[PDB]
Amino acid sequence: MSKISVTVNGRRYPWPRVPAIAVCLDGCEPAYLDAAIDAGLMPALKRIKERGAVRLAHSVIPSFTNPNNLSIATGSPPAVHGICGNYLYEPSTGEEVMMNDPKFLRAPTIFQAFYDAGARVAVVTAKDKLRALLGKGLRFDEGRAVCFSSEKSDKATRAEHGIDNASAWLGRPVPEVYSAALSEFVFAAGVKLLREFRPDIMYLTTTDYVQHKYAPGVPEANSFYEMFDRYLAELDGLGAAIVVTADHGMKPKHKADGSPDVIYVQDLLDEWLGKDAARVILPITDPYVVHHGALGSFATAYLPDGCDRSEIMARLKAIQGVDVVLGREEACRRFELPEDRIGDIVLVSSENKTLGTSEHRHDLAALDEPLRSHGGLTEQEVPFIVNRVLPELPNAPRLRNFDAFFYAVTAAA
C-alpha cells in the first residue's frame, strides 16, 4: 500500500493518523517558557519537552504576526503567499491598501489543501482579520470545517464559520480584545474542538498582548503560560500530535529612562532626498494608528526615481541602531519576500531599538510600560516543541516556524 499525502505549495504532507495540531504562541520569546517552567508552572510542557522533541526555529523576516501566521498556514515564506506586512504602498497615486483581506493571499493554505482532500479542518484565531485570511478556501456545507476568532466568536454562523455562535457553544463570554483571555478562549475552543469535532488538522493562534506588556518571568507573563499549560496538558492527553511554536519573539526596545529608543527613518530621508520625496513604510501594524503601537524593528522605504540607492543605503548603515540595510533584490532573496510588495530598501534595527517614520506628528506614547516589540533578526528565534519522539527534526536555521504543520502531520503519521 502506498501512503496517503496532500501536496501544498511544493511540500508533501502525510495524512495524519491522529489529529495534528499546531499552536502559535504569539510573541513567545523562548525565555517566557524557560521562566514559567522553572517556576514549576508548566508541568505538562516540562514533561512533553523531556519526552518529545525540543528545538529552536527561525521565523520569517519581518518577524511580524501576519507574515508569520500566513507562512505557518501555507508552509511557505511570503515570497510564495504574498503577505509580507499589514499594508502595501502604491508607488504611483500614493495609495495605501491593506494586507488583511484574503484576496491578497496568493497561495493555498494547508487547511484548504487538506479540506479539499476530504479532511476535517479547524482554525481558531484570537483576532478576526487573521481569521478571514487563514480561512480562505475553506467551505462550511459538509460539516468538515470550523474557522472563527475569539474576538467575533458570538458572531459565528454555521454557513460562514462552521459553527453557530462559538461563545454560546463554548460557554464562555467574548473576551476583551486587549487581554490574556482573548488567547485563553482560543485554547479552550481548541480543546473542545478536539473532543467534539475531532479535526485531522487544527491551527490555534493567539495574540502577543501579554508579551508586549510583560517581560519573561514576571508574574503576569508566568500566569499566562501557566494557563496555557493546562490546555496543552488536555490536548496532549487526548492523543493529538502537537507542535508548539511562535510567529516571532519579543525583546525590550527601551532606553535606560524607559522611553522608546527609535530611529526616525523618514526624518533622515527628508534631509538627504527632500521632504516626502521618499516614503517609509512600517509593516508592523495599520498606518492610521499613532498610539506607540506602530513601533517595530523592520522597515521598508520607497525612494524617488534617479536617486543613488547605494549611497542612501551606506548612510543608513553607518547609523548606530541600524543593523541591516539591503536593496529590494538582496532583501527579497535573503528574507524570501515578494519583490512587488516591498520598497526599494529594507531596514532592520538593532536588538533594543525600533524604526519609526518622523517626529513631526510623532508617535503618541500612551501606555506606561517600557517598550517591548519585534520585527527584527533579534525576534526571529522561536520555540519549536513537539510532543513526539523526532530525533531527525532539524534545528534553526534549517528549522522554520512554518515547518510546524509538516512536522505535526509527520509526527501524527
The residues of the shown chain that bind Zn ion, judged by CB under 5 A, are 26, 65, 208, 247
Ligand-binding site membership of 247 (annotated): yes
300 is in an annotated binding site: no
What are the distances in angstroms from CA 302 to CA 42, 62, 183, 306, 310?
A: 46, 17, 36, 12, 14
Q: If binding is defined by CB under 6 A, does position 71 make contact with ligand VO4?
A: no
Q: How far is the CB of 358 from ligand VO4 (least distance, A)?
A: 21
**Judged by CB, which is closer to ligand VO4: 114, or 298?**
298
- For the chain, counts of helices (H) and of strands (E): 15, 19
Tell me the HSE value of 57 on the side-chain side, using a 13 A CA sphere. 28
* Site membership for ligand VO4, residue 29 (CB under 6 A): no
Closest CB 388 distance from ligand VO4, rounded Å: 27
**15 touching ligand VO4, by CB under 6 A:** no
Residue 81 annotated as part of some ligand binding site: no
SS3 (DSSP) at 372:
strand
Which amino acid, residue 180? A
Contacting ligand VO4 (CB under 6 A), which of 23, 123, 240, 284?
284
Place of cell 488536555: 234
> From CA 263, how far away is CA 271, in angstroms rounded?
14
Q: Binding residue per annotation — 65?
A: yes
Q: What length does the chain have?
A: 413
Single-letter amino acid code for the residue at 261: D
Indicate if the alpha-carbon torsion angle 217, 209, 56, 234 is positive or negative.
positive
Half-sphere exposure of 120 (CA within 13 A, CB side): 15
Residue 179 three-state SS: coil
Residue 248 labelled as part of a binding site: yes
185, interface contact from Ni ion, Zn ion, ligand VO4, none, CB < 5-8 Å by kind: Ni ion
Matching residue, cell 532539524 = 394
Contacted by 184, from ligand VO4, Zn ion, Ni ion, none: CB < 5 to 8 Å by type:
Ni ion
Q: Identify which of 353, 327, 358, 325 has the alpha carbon closest to the alpha carbon of residue 342.
A: 327
Sheet-wide strand order for 345-349: 279-281, 298-302, 345-349, 322-327
- Tell me, residue by residue from 101 to 120, as one string, x for binding to ligand VO4 by CB under 6 A and - for no binding: --------------------
Q: Is 254 annotated as a binding residue?
A: no
How far apart CA 407 and CA 209 sit, in angstroms, is 28
Determine contact, residues 95/86, Cβ cutoff 8 Å: no
208 interacts with ligand VO4 by CB under 6 A: yes
Identify which of residues 23 and 278 has a Cβ nearer to Zn ion in the complex. 23
CB of 81 to ligand VO4, least distance (A): 16
Binding site partner of 53, from Zn ion, ligand VO4, Ni ion, none, Cβ cut-off 5-8 A by kind? none
Closer by beta carbon to Ni ion, 148 or else 406:
148
Under rule CB under 6 A, residue 64 binds ligand VO4: yes
Q: Is 26 in the site for ligand VO4 (CB under 6 A)?
A: yes
Binding stretches for Ni ion (CB under 5 A): 172, 181, 184-185
Q: At what angle do helices 181-196 and 219-237 cross, to 10 degrees?
A: 0
- Beta-carbon count within 10 A of 367 CB: 13
Q: Which does 284 bind (CB under 5 to 8 A by kind): Zn ion, Ni ion, ligand VO4, none?
A: ligand VO4
Does residue 65 bind ligand VO4 (CB under 6 A)? yes
In angstroms, give the least distance from the CB of 349 to ligand VO4. Answer: 15
Q: Which residue is nearest to Zn ion (CB)?
A: 65
User: Would the annotation count 291 as a binding residue?
Assistant: no
Q: How far apart are the C-alpha atoms of 242 and 405, rounded to whole Å?
A: 9
User: With respect to Ni ion, which residue has the nearer C-beta, 181 or 411?
Assistant: 181
Q: Is the peptide bond before 77 cis (omega within 30 degrees of 0)?
A: no
Which does residue 172 touch among Zn ion, Ni ion, ligand VO4, none (CB within 5 to 8 A, set by kind)? Ni ion
Q: Which residue is nearest to ligand VO4 (CB)?
A: 65
What are the grid coordinates assigned to 200, written together? 485531522
Residues at the annotated binding site for Zn(2+)? 26, 65, 208, 212, 247-248, 374
Binding-site entries: 26, 65, 208, 212, 247-248, 374
- Residues at the interface with ligand VO4 (CB under 6 A): 26-27, 64-65, 208, 284
